[PDB]
Nucleic acid binder design. Structure first.
Lengths: 37, 212, 121, 46, 116, 61
RNA sequence: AAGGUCACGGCGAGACGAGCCGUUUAUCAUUACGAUAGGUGUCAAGUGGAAGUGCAGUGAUGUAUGCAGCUGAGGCAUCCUAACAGACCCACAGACUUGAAC
RNA sequence: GGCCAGUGAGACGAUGGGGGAUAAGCUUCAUCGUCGAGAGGGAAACAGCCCGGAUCACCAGCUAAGGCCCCUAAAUGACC
RNA sequence: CUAUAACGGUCCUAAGGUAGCGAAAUUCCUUGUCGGGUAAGUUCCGACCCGCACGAAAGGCGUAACGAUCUGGGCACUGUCUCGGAGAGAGGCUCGGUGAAAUAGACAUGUCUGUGAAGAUGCGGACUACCUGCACCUGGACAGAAAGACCCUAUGAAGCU
RNA sequence: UUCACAUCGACGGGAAGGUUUGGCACCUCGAUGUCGGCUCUUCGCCACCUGGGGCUGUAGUAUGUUCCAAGGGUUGGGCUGUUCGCCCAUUAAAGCGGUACGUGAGCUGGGUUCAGAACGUCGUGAGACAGUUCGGUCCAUAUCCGGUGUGGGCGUUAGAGCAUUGAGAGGACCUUUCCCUAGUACGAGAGGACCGGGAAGGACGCACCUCUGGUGUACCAGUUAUCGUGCCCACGGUAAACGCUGGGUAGCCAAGUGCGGAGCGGAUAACUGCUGAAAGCAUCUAAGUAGUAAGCCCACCCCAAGAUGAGUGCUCUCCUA
């Protein structure tokens, strides 16, 4: 996990998904798996 | 909800059973003044739950009032003092007409729970009710054995309810759990049970199988 | 019952005479050390021809005690002194000849203390 | 320990009448003992 | 708590209680009928039953323990010459605890001891 | 304690908690609190005064 | 009236109230109840050899009677004593209204 | 002008600023409003915010501020 | 070699601290650094001298004996303690007699939370509580005392220099 | 080693909290008693450990960081009045704070350093130091609220004796090594698992006195001084509330003895998902739905219909004029 509350989608496959109210960021690399603000 | 009917018996001192392996176990000795006759069953039809109502201590008729002895003679049984039910799930086959149930049902079931009136100790302090600590016995101290602080400062303005004060310690019933059975006596009407029942020899004692 | 300020005599010839035991290991009660519990001893006095001097923290084993010892056989064993064996964490002591008798339940964890003992009761 | 204020006529007549009602309860016992002290075979009061 | 402590202690300390027992059972054996309080009455009942049955078997050892317990000299020797002739076949129960009116000044429950 | 926990556990405390804050909670709303008769079953045990159904004026339910 | 309360004899219950157990021709007989407390008689149990006498010793003392003597808060038996005499509270179909069948 | 008093500790709110850290229900000034010395209504309660200035009576009506589901008076009002 | 100053010059005074002592009843930094004691020692003892701010009759440095003096350590000893427990008295509890006191606006005298002279049983909302005793405990009533000894004001009082 | 975002993050910026030092002087000086310790709470999460997970420059052990989660725990000591802090032995870990020092109408030391004295320094001096040292009275019968126990009255629509359902509330739901799996996965070796079981502990709690004891002024036994029982013997009194000792039954107690902490029970927080659309690709979700936390609830032990919503069941009694 990364609670980076405001970082952009940073890898070239960082899809941006709002699930259950919260905004998360997924990518192929598990580094970029973030839950945003 | 209990997992089965139990009995009730009286405590008759403690001793030590010598197992033939060589161990020495401290057992309590249970007697039975009169058989635990099922007096009144309460099923799902005529009552909101299902329970089997047994009793104990056959007595003289002068010892027992008119509603009590009328209730016991409604079942056609002997007049007896003690009277308790066990709530049991609706698969029961128990007639309230003089089921003098024998005590064989606990030996293979080597786990039993017991309930009883513990011995009362009267109005005892906080040093033995709730296992507090005493103050300094010396070094100029004055709060020996006392209760200490009671609450917080100005912002509560009161003391919290359920705060540990002195009060009457013993007298209520307790249940100690999963107590492994031992050598019954089919002629001495006596059951060995390895443990320590609540109370001195003489009191009533619920003896009902486990609820694990 | 071995408090963390007791004096225990030695039960071996490791090089000490008695010890101030400090703060037992294993059983986390630490205000009641029964048999078989290792203790973080410090040397109160010793034999001055051995590499065990004064003020030396060591680990030892409580092998005798003035407090009773409940056995399942019905017996209760108790001594008149307190004794420890200057021990290492790999079983055996660094002192060979064990002085005084011990019990036999500590054979299930400390077999070298029993095998080097004069009497096992 | 020192009382902050005083009590009413209300609470005082309550407590004093509980005290005197506690005196009422210990004379029907004395009426029973005075009635058993009368003519009858009782093994007491020599 | 007092579970099973069957000594009956009075409002007096231990040795003073012993002297109250010995003196009041002594003058109880002197006059026969006596006015006590009820705690003093039962406390006389146990010990004076012990002193009637003590010199029931009139040996020297019983007479010397009995003379050791009772204060007055000439009342022990008036006792074993009286208790087998009177209190034979009674087999216990040598007194009676006839109660009376309470005492003016204390409301003390006041009792009255016989020899029957 | 949430709404589904009472509605699974004791449902007739739901409405009984809704209307108790609707009545004037003094000595008189406490008297007309007992006028409420909520039952979880499909049938009520009352045959008191032949209870006529309640008239509604609420177009949004 | 049923049932309680006082009194009574107490408790493994208890500050006081509470609570609990008794409150007597207190079994009679073929087999669980009608011994509450004290005393008594015995049995566990504690300390541990009592007094008196004899014997040995100059005497301190030891020894036999004699696990004797006292203790008996515990168990059982026993009605010998006290549970006698009483008193008091609560009574007299349980307001009014609907529905069902009888 | 004559006789004759108090008062000379102010407080908050808007604007104009200084001190502060453009921090304080902070401090000091300048104009104004209220309280002080002001009741009532709205603000859940609550000196200074809004309406408003209480001679008294009425089991009279119309309104300002503000509100119209229930507690608690009036719309479970209409249309976007 | 790194140092440190035997030694030197200069300014100002009346003179620039002698012996001995020295992180001391004196050392702020500081729990200075080292050694001893202790498992571990801001306390203790022995030293170095960087003495904020020792020092020679406001005496300095020592020491036998002495001290209800201060302080550091050790042996024996124990409920001081781990960790409490039992028993005996005088109270406490009950009954009968006698019988006050401080205090007190009237008290029909809840909890949370919020507001308010910014810490509310008394105002607001909610929740909780049948009435009334007895025995203990003292968190609140900004509890009782007693016109705050501390702080400031008085064109106050007094002692002393 | 490459690589801003495994982990730190310079130069800067934006917040929350009211736990430090501060600023204001708004309540209180006809009195709101500071700092530390003992006793005893309760609460927050900004998490030290325990439970679940993500990422890792995570091979495994152990981690680093972070999410959910405050149920429970958070040692014994040497120094100091100490808070803090240093050190020793450890432990799963030895958390930080609020409650006016949380708590002196519950209790004791340094201090608002009170009155005596001494050292340094300042002052001509009296005296003084946010310098040091020695000594230095701390009160109290609870009126009310609050609490813990325990009644009495009345009510519960006739009056009772029992028997229980349980709304609501309490307590308990804690934790560590060791062994099998297995020296197996993994690793060149060295090391050494997850998961699922067992066993021994620790604290806590409920009991009990069968054993081991402490006490035991019911007791019995030894002995000193003395006075009485006429005297010897033998006893009794006193040497506070045992003369001093030696043991002890029944009580009470633990250090002793038993037992407890159970749940393929329900729903969830973080997360992993299964189909799966708004953008014919996708995505844990927008429809539905699955695993799963020491957390919530239920089950567990006790009280419990004053639960005025006052319950349910059985049984007794209301007669005479």
């Amino acid at each position: 996990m990364k609670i980076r509350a405001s970082v952009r989608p940073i890898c070239e496959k960082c899809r941006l998904i709002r699930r259950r109210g919260r905004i998360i960021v997924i990518c192929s690399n598990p580094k970029h798996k973030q839950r945003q603000g | 909800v209990d997992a089965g009917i139990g009995v009730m018996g009286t405590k008759l001192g403690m001793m030590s059973f010598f197992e033939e392996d060589g161990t020495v176990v401290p057992v309590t000795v249970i007697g039975f003044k009169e058989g635990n006759i099922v007096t009144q069953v309460k099923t799902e039809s005529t009552d909101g739950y299902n329970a089997v109502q047994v009793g104990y201590e056959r007595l003289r008729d002068r010892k027992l009032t008119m509603p009590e002895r009328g209730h016991l003679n409604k079942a056609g049984v002997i007049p007896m003092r003690h009277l308790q039910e066990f709530r049991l799930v609706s698969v029961d086959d128990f007639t309230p007409s003089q089921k003098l149930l024998f005590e064989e049902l606990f030996k293979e079931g080597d786990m039993v729970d017991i309930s009883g009136t513990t011995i009362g100790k009267g109005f005892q302090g906080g040093i033995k009710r709730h296992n507090f600590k005493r103050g300094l016995m010396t070094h100029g101290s004055k709060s020996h054995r006392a209760l200490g602080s009671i609450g917080a400062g100005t912002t509560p303005g009161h003391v919290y309810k359920g705060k540990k004060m002195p009060g009457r310690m013993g007298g209520t019933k307790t249940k100690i759990r999963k107590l492994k059975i031992m050598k019954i006596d089919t002629d001495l009407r006596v059951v060995m049970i390895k443990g320590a029942v609540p109370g001195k020899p003489g009191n009533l004692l619920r003896l009902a199988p486990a609820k694990i | 019952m071995i408090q963390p300020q007791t004096h225990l005599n030695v039960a071996d010839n490791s090089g000490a005479r008695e010890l101030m035991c400090i703060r037992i290991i294993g059983a986390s009660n630490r205000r009641y050390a029964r048999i078989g519990d290792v203790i973080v001893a410090v040397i109160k006095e010793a034999i001055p021809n051995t590499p065990l001097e004064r003020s030396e923290v060591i680990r030892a084993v409580v092998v005798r005690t003035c407090k009773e010892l409940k056995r399942d056989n019905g017996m209760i064993i108790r001594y008149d002194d307190n004794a420890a064996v200057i021990i290492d964490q790999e079983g055996n002591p660094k002192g060979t000849r064990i002085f005084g008798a011990i019990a036999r339940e500590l054979r299930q964890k400390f077999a070298k203390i029993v095998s080097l003992a004069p009497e096992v009761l | 320990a020192v009382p902050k204020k005083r009590t009413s006529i209300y609470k005082k007549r309550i407590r004093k009448n509980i005290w005197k009602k506690k005196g009422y309860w210990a004379a029907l016992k004395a009426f029973s003992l005075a009635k058993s002290l009368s003519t009858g075979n009782s093994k007491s009061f020599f | 708590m007092k579970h099973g402590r069957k000594i009956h202690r009075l409002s007096r300390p231990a040795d003073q209680r012993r002297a109250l027992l010995r003196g009041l059972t002594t003058q109880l054996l002197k006059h026969g009928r006596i006015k006590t309080t009820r705690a003093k009455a039962s406390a006389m009942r146990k010990y004076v039953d012990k002193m009637i049955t003590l010199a029931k078997e009139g040996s020297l050892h019983k007479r010397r323990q009995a003379l050791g317990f009772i204060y007055e000299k000439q009342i022990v020797h008036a006792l074993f010459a009286e208790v087998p002739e009177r209190y034979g076949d009674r087999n216990g129960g040598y007194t009676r605890i006839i109660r009376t009116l309470p005492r003016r000044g204390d409301n003390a429950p006041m009792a009255y001891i016989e020899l029957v | 304690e949430t709404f589904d926990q009472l509605q699974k556990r004791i449902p007739e405390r739901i409405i009984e908690h809704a209307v108790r804050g609707m009545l004037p909670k003094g000595r008189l709303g406490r008297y007309l609190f007992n006028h409420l008769k909520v039952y979880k079953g499909a049938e009520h045990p009352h045959q008191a005064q032949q209870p006529i159904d309640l008239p509604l004026r609420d177009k949004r339910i």
